[PDB]
Design a protein around this ligand. Structure first.
Ligand SMILES: *[C@@H]1O[C@H](CO)[C@@H](O[C@@H]2O[C@H](CO)[C@@H](O)[C@H](O)[C@H]2NC(C)=O)[C@H](O)[C@H]1NC(C)=O
Lengths: 49, 226
């Protein structure tokens, strides 16, 4: 509060100082179960362009 | 108008590594891609590898991975194929071939074939053929034309030569492909036609020259006691 009002003494009242936010406890990833690699070999590396 | 003479070749034992070198003549060597094309006995054509006109890019075959490497000594107009760890299936005449730079990319169809060697894959001794007669002396009773011949059992490698009475008989001269013994030993029968009424008129000599070991042994083919 002292830093919000920029004073070393504060007067009786209610002051809004900051914001509360719950924090993420975990990180999850969901991707499809596709498995086969991709045919980049026969696109970049091919005889006849 | 291109001639290719291939060095190297001969019988080889599996697990050994050696190399061929094919000298080219009749053109500008350092501006043509080279190919190795296997000609297997009884199979046909099998592509092996290709080296760029400058030798910049190298392509090898699928079932050849882990076996061969192919370089190109442009100075003496030669294509080198270092083959390693050969297997018994790799006997063939491996024709070196000169490409034509005609397709849009740096590879195209091939026109000129050079007569490659006969690198022979086997883990065994080079056994010379023993010449055996073939005259039943009682079963040639066909009257006019009965087939009687010669056995060339146990010859390796296959280069072989049959002449009947120094080639005196020319009609019905059956020279057969190898009849392979189950132990992989080569054999063949070469026969000619005889009227059985004239069995002993001309004494028959089967002359075989076995090029690998120069086995120069001859054997009679005559109506026996049998
Ligand atoms: C065709 O193109 C691919 C790129 O998509 C290249 O990948 C090579 O793979 C081999 C084996 O690991 C290594 O030489 C290099 O990882 C890649 N070569 C390079 C960077 O020159 C390669 O040119 C070709 N792929 C294969 C399997 O030959």
């Amino acid at each position: 509060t002292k830093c919000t009002l920029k004073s070393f003494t504060v007067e009786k009242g209610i002051y809004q100082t900051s914001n509360f936010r719950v924090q993420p406890t975990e990180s999850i990833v969901r991707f499809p179960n596709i498995t086969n690699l991709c045919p980049f070999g026969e696109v970049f590396n091919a005889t006849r362009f | 108008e291109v001639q290719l003479v291939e060095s190297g070749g001969g019988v080889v034992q599996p697990g050994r590594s050696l190399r061929l070198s094919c000298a080219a003549s009749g053109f500008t060597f350092s501006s043509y891609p080279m190919h190795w094309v296997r000609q297997a006995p009884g199979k046909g054509l099998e592509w092996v590898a290709v080296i760029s006109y400058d030798g910049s890019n190298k392509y090898y075959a699928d079932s050849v991975k882990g076996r061969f490497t192919i370089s190109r000594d442009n100075s003496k107009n030669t294509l080198y194929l270092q083959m390693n760890s050969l297997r018994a299936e790799d006997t063939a005449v491996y024709y070196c071939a000169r490409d034509t730079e005609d397709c849009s990319s740096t590879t195209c169809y091939v026109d000129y074939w050079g007569q490659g060697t006969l690198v022979t894959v086997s883990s065994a001794s080079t056994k010379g053929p023993s010449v055996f007669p073939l005259a039943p002396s009682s079963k040639s009773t066909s009257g006019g034309t009965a087939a009687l011949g010669c056995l060339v059992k146990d010859y390796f490698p296959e280069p072989v030569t049959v002449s009947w009475n120094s080639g005196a008989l020319t009609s019905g001269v059956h020279t057969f492909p190898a009849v392979l013994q189950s132990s992989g030993l080569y054999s063949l029968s070469s026969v000619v036609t005889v009227p059985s009424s004239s069995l002993g008129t001309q004494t028959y000599i089967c002359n075989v020259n076995h090029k690998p070991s120069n086995t120069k042994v001859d054997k009679k083919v005559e109506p026996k006691s049998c």
